[PDB]
Each structure stands twice: as C-alpha cells, then as structure tokens.
Amino acid sequence: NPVERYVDEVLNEVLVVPNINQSHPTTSNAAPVLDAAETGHTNKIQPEDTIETRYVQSSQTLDEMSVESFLGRSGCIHESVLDIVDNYNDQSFTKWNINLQEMAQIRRKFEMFTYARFDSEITMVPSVAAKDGHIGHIVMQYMYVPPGAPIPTTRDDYAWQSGTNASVFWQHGQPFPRFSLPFLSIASAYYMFYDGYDGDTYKSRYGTVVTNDMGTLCSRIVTSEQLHKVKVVTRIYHKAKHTKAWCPRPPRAVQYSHTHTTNYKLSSEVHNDVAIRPRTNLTTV
Amino acid sequence: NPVERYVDEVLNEVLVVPNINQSHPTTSNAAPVLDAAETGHTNKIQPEDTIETRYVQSSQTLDEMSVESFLGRSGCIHESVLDIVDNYNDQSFTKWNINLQEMAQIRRKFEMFTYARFDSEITMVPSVAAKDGHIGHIVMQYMYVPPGAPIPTTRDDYAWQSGTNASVFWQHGQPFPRFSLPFLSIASAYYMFYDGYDGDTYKSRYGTVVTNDMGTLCSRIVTSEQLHKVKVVTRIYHKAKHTKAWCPRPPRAVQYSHTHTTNYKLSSEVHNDVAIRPRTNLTTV
Amino acid sequence: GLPVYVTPGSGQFMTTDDMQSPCALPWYHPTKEIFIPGEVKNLIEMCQVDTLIPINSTQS
C-alpha cells in the first residue's frame, strides 16, 4: 500500500534491521565459529551462535545508509572566481572544464564505487565582494557549453547569444539558481575508474579523462563595466539524484594530487601520508 | 491514454526509433544496394540489407529532435542600450524595429525552414551598470508599438501613457520580466524567405522586409534624472512555442551581413568564408 | 491571485534539502540502462564483508 509505504518514508523505517533472538547453551559437533576465510566468503556467524542472547526487538533502520542517501547530499565541486582588477573585458568572464574530481570530499564518496549512474542537481551560490565599496546591479550568466559547441573568447562573443545552449541568468538579490541535469553519459553509467586508453601508443591518454568529458561551464558578468570593481565568487554545489552504483571499492587512503588520475605522492615517512596512527606495540590499546 | 502519454513525456520516449532485426546471407537477383539517384529519391536501404546483423532493441528517442525542441530554446535577439552620458532627456529612451535577423545563432535555425508559425515567449534581462557609483531606484518601461501607433519622440511623450498599447514595467530588484505573444502575422505563417517585391519597379524593395513588419519596441527609464549616471543594457530573449515549420532548406553557409537579406561578402580566398576545411588530397583523412 | 504567506526558510539553500528543479536539458533521453554485475543499494552491504585489520601497525 503506497500510503503505508508513505508513512515508512516519513518515519524513515523502510529498511528495518533484524531482531536478536534468545539463544541457549549448546554442545554440538557443528561449530559455526570455525570456517575458512580462504574461500573468499565471510563467515555469517551471528551473536546467537557464540553467546546466550536474550530476545531484543530491533528498531534501527538502514534508510540513511542507502546509496541514495550517501551520495544525495549537495557538496561543493568548484569555486569560480571573477576578479576585476585592471581589465574588465578580460576579467569579467571565465570557463571551467566540468568534473567531480577537484574537491576531495565528494570525489572520495563517489570513488567508493566503480560505476555510478545518476541525475544531477546543481545549485550555485554567488557572492559579490565590493572591493571598492558599491556593487551596483550584478547580473550573471552561466552557460553550459557541450563538447563541440563554440567557446566564447571575449565577454561579447556571439556564443553568449545562447541560441541553443542552456544558460541561467541570475540577478543579485534573487534566490540561489538551481537546475537539474539528466544522466549525461554516452555509456550506460559513468566510469569512476577506467583501466583503459584512447589509443594503443606510448602517448595515449590513460584513465577517466578518456571517457568523462562533460563539456565546459562559461560564466560572465552580464552587467557592463561599472565604476567600482567587484570580485564575484560562484560556488557550484552538486547532488546526485536517482542514484545507482556498482562494484564497491576501497576508499582513497592518501591525498589526491590530480584530476582524473589515481596518482599520489609519498614522503620519506609514509606513516604521515595515511590515516593510520602508529601503535606503540601490539598490546597497547 | 493521456496518462501513458504523460509518462512518455516525463521519460522523453514519445518518438522511438525502430529496432535492428537479425539478417542472414543472401544470394538473389534483387539488389537493394543498387538504385538510381537520378529519380530524386533516397535509396531506403537499411543495415540488414548489406550485412548480417544481429537483433538489437533500440531505446533511442527522437523527441529532442522535434521542431518544437529545436526552436524551443530562448536565445538573445537584441541588446538595448541606454547610456546616460550628458543629456538625460535624450539618452533615457530608445526604440528598436523588431526582428529576428540581428543575431546569427537563432536566425540560422529559423532559416532552415521556408515558413514557420509559432507563438513567442519574450524574456528580458536588464542590467544596470553604476557608472558613477550608485544606481538609485531604476524602473523601466518597455512599450510595444504596433505599426501605425505613434512612436514617442521624447521621454515624456504622451504616447508613453500606453492607453492601448501593451507596456511592461520592471522595477530593479524584481525578477526578469516575461510575457507571451500570439502568432502575429496577417498571413498564415511567417516568411523566413520571400522571393518577392512590394511593387513592380526598379526601386521596389525585395525580400522579407516587405512582409515581416512587427512594429517597434520603445524603452525608457521611468525614473527621473538622478545624480549618478547609469548604463542600462536590456537583453531581449526569444523562444518559439507551439511551433510548425514548412519546406526545409540548406543551412546558411557564410556569415550574415544584413537583416532581411541573403546578401553576403566573399574574400579573394573563398575557403576562408565557408566552414569547409581544405583537404590535402582525396586520400588524406 | 491566491493569497500566500512566505515562511521563514524561503530562499535559503540547505545542502540536505529535497526539492525539485527545472531540467536544463528538456526532451533529452538518457542512455539505455544495461545490466552490470555488482550493484550496491545500501552501504550495509559493504559493512558485512570482511576486510583486514592493520593490527600490527607499529611505526616500523
């Protein structure tokens, strides 16, 4: 019943954990505690098998641990800066090659899976710093330029006409802009990792850079030159919606160094490069 | 069922492409690959006819390729400038003879058809540049003046009373103005091209200028003179809604030079005037 | 028009909100989903798999 299911949504009790049943003393030639990890399987022993348990009714739920919940939180993925210093025409617009690799926090979460399929929700938080005192009337234009479309080379480039591309115009004072994007890949899922190249020569590229091209985000202050200079920083937030993930993997253990690659750097004292805190010895807790 | 149809809308699966069926080896005196282009028809041969194909279930849709989708994106068609330099009365108002010929991006798309019929959605993006520091309280008036109605010659002209004409007043800080316009032509469709004149003499006008008069858009800063000068740039965006198009034609291959005419200019090195990149020879890919 | 009362919270952006928003790419039809082995639906699935404990993690 969609209404009972609805109540479960409101209470967050869609996925309930099992109860603990009462157990008793045993003397048997069946030893659940003994097994063979060599098989590659985890021994499914439960508390009732090793001690005498009481009956306990569980009220915990796994809803919050769902993939939708784990990846369904908006995090920053880019901080765009438009700093007007001495040349308005050159400093009033910019571009960014889109990717989810530049900010460690969300990158690490997505990379706990090999493939992922999801729709995206982008929310932008623009902040205009009045370097000289006043900000005037700031109007921004964010244009999505798919791979192949002409990228504007000047603040008055004809490409800004956005005759076909999707542009979002924001007016200072109005609420934060936000829109959704459908799963964009040419494949059935996004590659979080890719053990492949775009060719078979020594100079072929390796990794996700080969498969994950999402285009370019071009920004510009629509307002013409003003007396007072401003510094507009637009932070882009991304959230995954209607998510599916495949083949879980170990979490990144060392810091990231570059986009689209697993490359890392190690110091002479590797214990400083990982989160493992050195133990004094085996018996010191 | 309008609900099933509804689901197709949400999923964008209204127009599905056919499947590829499995084919087999053939030895026949029926040669589908052979035909005669002289007839003016395209040979309807499909992959199953030339190779041994497997069965594949298609999941692609043509929804996005519809005329409604192609022309249903808002693009800029005019950038109105009101720059207060030294005379408020003269510089605080302006006028524009409406047309969709001034911006190449949307013009080229509409011109891929001979006739088109659609309703229009106009969205305006005003940006006030504080030339002297403050912008005060900017209130704009955009008045649509149909052919024949009196055009204001001063910022306080009686025509601004808008007793009958449609005027849109925008207040700085409020969301971008937007309105819809019904198909305006006196004919059944708009002429994208017109091989005709408005008379039969050597001085008769030629082309769409004869048929496509949409009137004038008159703008004015309603606010009276302020201490600080501002430069208000209003960008007009246009989107076609409920579209129909007839007789497709080749896309514009050279740059546009003027409105309402197909005129073009050629340099001494024509290969620079078209998008065709010179080949080294016939066998160099 | 319908009289409305704008409530506190309006216009804010909460990273954990759950709202709808217009799609930047209307009419776009996503690539067909194919079967891929190993789908994970809940992190609990990963917590039920044995992994090694770096128990002898002395500095050396």
């Binding site: 209404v3 369904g72 729709d119 919606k241 | - | 799609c23």
Partner: peptide, 29 residues
C-alpha cells in the same frame, strides 16, 4: 504529475516539471 493515494490519509506525490531528472530523491528498494 500527481500520484493520489487514499487510505482518510491521501498522498499527493506531485511532479511539478516534465523531465524525470527534475524530481526529488528516489524512494527506497
């Protein structure tokens, strides 16, 4: 876009836009 249930406790799962990407977080299972 309205999925109206009844139990009375009526549920209205409204979808305000015409693209599936536009809807909020997915249900579970």
């Amino acid at each position: 876009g309205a999925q109206v249930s009844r139990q009375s406790l009526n549920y209205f799962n409204i979808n305000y836009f015409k693209d599936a990407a536009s809807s909020g977080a997915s249900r579970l299972d």
